[model samples]
Target: MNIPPARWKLTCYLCKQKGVGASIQCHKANCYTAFHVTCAQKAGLYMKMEPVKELTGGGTTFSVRKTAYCDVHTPPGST
Candidate 1:
């Protein structure tokens, strides 16, 4: 299935700060939350940016990855 990426502004969930590079989303399911790497880090949220294999048809594949969330999204003492 050709799933389109999420369409939305890359606004930080922390302070509405804009990100210069890549943005992250909340790990929580069904959440549309997004945040900047720095912003999320500042809020004590962990993000993992690792290579992900993607199939490009014709038996071709490529690696790609990017790195969310808010304080309210975190559980108590999870920070």
Candidate 2:
């Protein structure tokens, strides 16, 4: 879940409820909303799984990262 204790004060943006489970934060810097991953999926708000690139002193690594954006922050006509 990886939820910090401070996040307990915030509720799920999709369900408008609390304590459902693990939560994901909005990707936009201007938006400060969090939501349950499944809740967003049910609401058709799930975004893409992006590949995150990281470079170390010795090598580079890529990992799949899941992301979501609330309806308010999403581009128009996007699901």
lDDT of the candidates, in the order given: 0.64, 0.72
If scored against the real structure, what TM-score would every candidate get?
A: 0.46, 0.58
lDDT of 1: 0.64
Best by TM-score: 2
- Minimal lDDT window, size 10, model 1: 65-74
Give the clash count for each candidate.
0, 0
Compared with the true structure, what per-residue lDDT tens digits does model 1 show for residues 10-47? Answer: 77656567557657776656666777666666777655
lDDT of 2 by residue, 1-79 (tens): 9856664545876777767677777776667678776777777864878898988677898888866677567774454
User: In model 1, what are the clashing residue pairs, if there are any?
Assistant: none
Q: Candidate 2: where are CA atoms >4 Å away?
A: 1-9, 53-62, 75-79
Candidate 1 has what TM-score? 0.46
Q: Which stretches of candidate 1 lie over 4 Å from their true place?
A: 1-8, 17-19, 48-69, 76-79
